[PDB]
Amino acid sequence: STGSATTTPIDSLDDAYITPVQIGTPAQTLNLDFDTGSSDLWVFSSETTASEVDGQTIYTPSKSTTAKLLSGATWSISYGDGSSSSGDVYTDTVSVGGLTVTGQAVESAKKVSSSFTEDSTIDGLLGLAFSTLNTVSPTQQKTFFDNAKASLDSPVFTADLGYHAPGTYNFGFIDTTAYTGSITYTAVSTKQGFWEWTSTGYAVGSGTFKSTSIDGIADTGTTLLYLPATVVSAYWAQVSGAKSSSSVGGYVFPCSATLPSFTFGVGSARIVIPGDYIDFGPISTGSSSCFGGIQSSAGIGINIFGDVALKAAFVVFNGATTPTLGFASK
């Protein structure tokens, strides 16, 4: 089997991407944030504290004839950005782009933190990291991909995120019309539960490539590109007036700037992030100070190849017995 679904930016900055997901019988369609950096499929629901719902579409398991309470199971998650959610668990039928999993753990939120409430466009998360990170207790649950894997034509999914435009998540096949050149595959460590890999280096604009190993994760659920402070300083030094602002919480630059590209290595291959992808707009409405899309990972504890990086590529998440990651230009 295969599945194919369009993923759409939530706003004009590509702060995140939502993908429609069918849950239950009859289908209840929720727009979920597909997150290769976590492993819980959780939704706003009829159980979510009323004051914590503001515009989201909710899953109502009592209206689904295939929903079953997973008795005794609870979940609780905190994300790298300080946001969190928790609740109980149902199993139900979940379909993405025509690909159906029966008995999927659908984690129903009883509580969500303010950041989730405040984002009316995201109805929940669909985790696509390794199931070892799933938070359900006392019986850990599998991700949608892990459940679908055996049935898929090939044990892969691909992320093709758009810049200020829709893109595609495919399951079970590689669309050879969706990228240019060849796909370069690179090794993955699953030891921390992430799609963790090692970039071979970087270049800033038209500058010479610096060969250097950068361990990091491919994370569709993180907006920006978080890299070592040395790398980030080298980038922003090429933008007149750019600076790290403690008050804003990262590098800002004059909105009048033309940003240089940023290249990252995948083996002997190179992925070029155009400068415009690195512009996240005024820090506040009407400001002439703009927020940078490349930021320091210092104090995160890990480098993160988030949407800024991933949207410059066609990305294969290969879930074969020995997982790997593939990157192509597009």
Curated annotation (Swiss-Prot):
It catalyses: Hydrolysis of proteins with specificity similar to that of pepsin A, prefers hydrophobic residues at P1 and P1', but does not cleave 14-Ala-|-Leu-15 in the B chain of insulin or Z-Glu-Tyr. Clots milk. This is Endothiapepsin. Keywords: Aspartyl protease, Disulfide bond, Hydrolase, Protease, Signal, Zymogen. Belongs to the peptidase A1 family. One of its GO terms (biological process) is proteolysis. It comes from Cryphonectria parasitica (Chestnut blight fungus). It comes from the Eukaryota. The lineage of its organism: Eukaryota, Fungi, Dikarya, Ascomycota, Pezizomycotina. It is an enzyme of class 3 (hydrolase).
